[PDB]
Design a protein around this ligand. Structure first.
Ligand SMILES: Cc1cc2nc3c(=O)[nH]c(=O)nc-3n(C[C@H](O)[C@H](O)[C@H](O)COP(=O)(O)OP(=O)(O)OC[C@H]3O[C@@H](n4cnc5c(N)ncnc54)[C@H](O)[C@@H]3O)c2cc1C
Ligand SMILES: NC(=O)c1ccc[n+]([C@@H]2O[C@H](COP(=O)([O-])OP(=O)(O)OC[C@H]3O[C@@H](n4cnc5c(N)ncnc54)[C@H](OP(=O)(O)O)[C@@H]3O)[C@@H](O)[C@H]2O)c1
Length: 531
């Protein structure tokens, strides 16, 4: 005796919160949501590591769809910490009475399409079964935990924390900590842990490029000036490419004098923001090799000013293309001048084994550790889809459908899987994410309503349309240097995972233009089954 509902939503982050609001409050459908978390927040429920903070400016790292909720927003700094975002997202849940629609502490273990009924059968880890005509997957593009295995790790004194599963209230003051990982998460937790711990050991494998964040206090008059121009601010954001609120440059870097190139880089550096350094200074830093090297070397010279010990600056000096997700920090490079901060270059002096009481290097040197923080990445974009049994038409598994690379049509849809939608699924926009999540959930909500109104019982894309979208994303990505960034953005960070394109990099405005032309062209690329 399964529970019948119109729509199932998986995940209670940004995407699920909004999807439950659109499907129930606006369209009046019966909806059930799920999250293995005990409450809402998604990313910001799980990542409670110290230093966790958004690189989207405070006034734009939030929903834009409700004007009253925009005029009630509050914040203290130019950027916003994890406890502030979790609080904001919880406030959205109470504001729209969404809580009662969500089954928390529950994991969706299977999602099986029943063709003869045109219904999805969704079963959970608690034993309950549901049947729905629509399924909306908001399972998170940076959500499936990546946890590398090390020799003898099952045999260790003390705790092993992956940053995306940090226990609330855990403080490491006065302890002896090691951190592995030098991406955005590692930098934040290294910078936050340095003043409190008595010895920090950073196992650095690939040092990265990072600019100052510039997180400045915000006055009431500043907030009010933003609130009285919210419409135009969001209008410009949604028409732009990366949607961070700053003017995106079209000036080629090597077309100006060396002094002007320096002046522009130094202005962004002093202002702050990783995305602004990459896209707000010149227009070809991500597509022109000479422009990219000008940006990379300017950052290197700054790191050489900061880190006094030249041998310490050597291990932390980033080489190669400036083509990973732009990073910014609250004083990351100054940490290594502290006497109680050690850097270990893992590529020269590798990790050999985890002992009972610490980590041994091929140094013939053990580093004792009360705690070992894992600042490693995510099985990004497609990870949380491959972890569960998703079968569509003819019972074809999602892993067999996504045999090689994960694919979509327009980032929100895939073939053989009718009435089945993805928020931040494969081959979607690469922007400030809340306004791209809103764009997707809005199109998904409008597409369900169109099915309900015109009596369609199954919508799904054609293989021809899906392959056309893959090619469109592949051609655009091949015009950039991100394809050679060697990061999670192209699926190169998980061993066993085959690299591929994973993002449409045409920008949010072009993406929204593509979605609107698809709808106006009577859902071009979509097969409709009626009656
Ligand atoms: C530390 C950090 C900082 C970031 N900073 C920024 C930033 O400044 N700007 C920006 O644009 N983006 C940022 N991001 C990225 C992005 O904005 C967030 O990941 C965003 O909140 C995604 O929202 P979501 O709802 O799509 O997914 P998530 O927040 O990841 O929510 C997915 C949810 O689905 C649940 N789930 C998955 N599978 C199942 C299942 N089988 N059953 C039940 N529940 C399931 C998970 O528990 C999770 O709670 C950051 C990400 C991280 C990790
Ligand atoms: N906006 C924000 O402030 C913010 C903050 C945190 C996260 N994020 C988002 O989340 C993404 C991922 O961030 P993240 O830093 O958690 O992930 P990440 O970019 O994948 O970083 C993983 C780190 O772990 C290292 N590592 C991986 N496997 C290892 C192994 N087997 N042994 C040793 N070291 C290993 C990596 O080194 P290698 O490079 O050598 O592989 C890297 O330094 C970011 O790009 C960003 O989109 C955003």
């Amino acid at each position: 005796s399964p529970t019948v509902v119109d729509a199932v939503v998986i995940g209670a982050g940004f995407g699920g919160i909004y999807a439950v609001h659109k499907l129930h409050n606006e369209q009046g459908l019966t909806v059930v949501g799920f999250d293995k978390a005990d409450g809402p927040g998604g990313t910001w429920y799980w990542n409670r590591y110290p230093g966790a903070l958004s690189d989207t400016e405070s006034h734009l790292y939030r929903f834009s769809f409700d004007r009253d909720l925009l005029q009630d927003g509050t914040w203290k700094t130019t950027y916003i910490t994890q406890p502030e975002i979790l609080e904001y997202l919880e406030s959205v849940v109470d504001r729209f009475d969404l809580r009662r629609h969500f089954r928390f502490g529950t994991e969706v273990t299977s999602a099986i399409y029943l063709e003869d009924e045109n219904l999805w059968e969704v079963s959970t880890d608690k034993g309950e079964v549901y049947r729905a005509k629509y399924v909306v997957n908001a399972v998170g593009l940076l959500s499936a935990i990546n946890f590398p295995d090390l020799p003898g790790l099952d045999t260790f004194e003390g705790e092993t924390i992956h940053t995306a599963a940090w226990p609330e209230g855990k403080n490491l003051a006065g302890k002896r900590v090691g951190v592995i990982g030098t991406g955005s998460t590692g930098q934040q937790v290294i910078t936050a842990l340095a003043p409190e711990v008595e010895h920090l050991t950073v196992f650095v494998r690939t040092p990265q490029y990072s600019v100052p964040v510039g997180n400045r206090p915000v006055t009431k008059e500043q907030i009010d000036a933003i609130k009285a121009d919210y419409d135009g601010i969001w209008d410009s954001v949604k028409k732009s490419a990366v949607a961070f609120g700053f003017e995106e440059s079209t000036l080629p870097a090597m077309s100006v004098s060396e002094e002007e190139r320096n002046r522009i880089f130094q202005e962004a550096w002093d202002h702050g923001g990783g995305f602004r350094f990459m896209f707000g200074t010149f227009g070809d830093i991500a597509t022109d090799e000479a422009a990219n090297e000008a940006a990379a070397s300017f950052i290197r010279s700054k790191i050489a000013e900061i880190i006094e010990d030249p041998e310490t600056a050597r291990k932390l000096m980033p080489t190669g293309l400036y083509a990973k997700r732009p990073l910014c920090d609250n004083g990351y490079y100054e940490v290594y001048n502290r006497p109680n901060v050690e850097a270990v270059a893992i590529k020269e002096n590798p990790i050999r084994e985890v002992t009972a009481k610490g980590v041994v290097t091929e140094d013939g040197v053990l580093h004792e550790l009360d705690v070992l923080v894992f600042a490693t990445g995510f099985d990004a974009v497609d990870g949380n889809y491959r972890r569960i049994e998703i079968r569509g038409r003819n019972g074809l598994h999602i892993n067999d459908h996504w045999d090689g690379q994960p694919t979509s049509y327009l980032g929100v849809t895939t073939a053989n899987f009718p009435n089945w939608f993805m928020v931040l699924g494969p081959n979607g926009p690469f922007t400030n994410l809340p306004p791209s999540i809103e764009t997707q959930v809005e199109w998904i909500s409008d597409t369900v309503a169109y099915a309900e109104r015109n009596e369609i019982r199954a919508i799904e894309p054609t293989p021809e349309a899906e392959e056309e979208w893959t090619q469109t994303c592949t051609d655009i990505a091949n015009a950039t240097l991100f394809t050679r960034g060697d990061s999670w953005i192209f699926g190169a960070n998980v061993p066993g995972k085959k690299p591929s394109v994973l993002f449409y990099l045409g920008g949010l405005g072009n993406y929204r233009n593509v979605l609107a032309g698809v709808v106006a062209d009577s859902y071009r690329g979509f097969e409709l089954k009626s009656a």
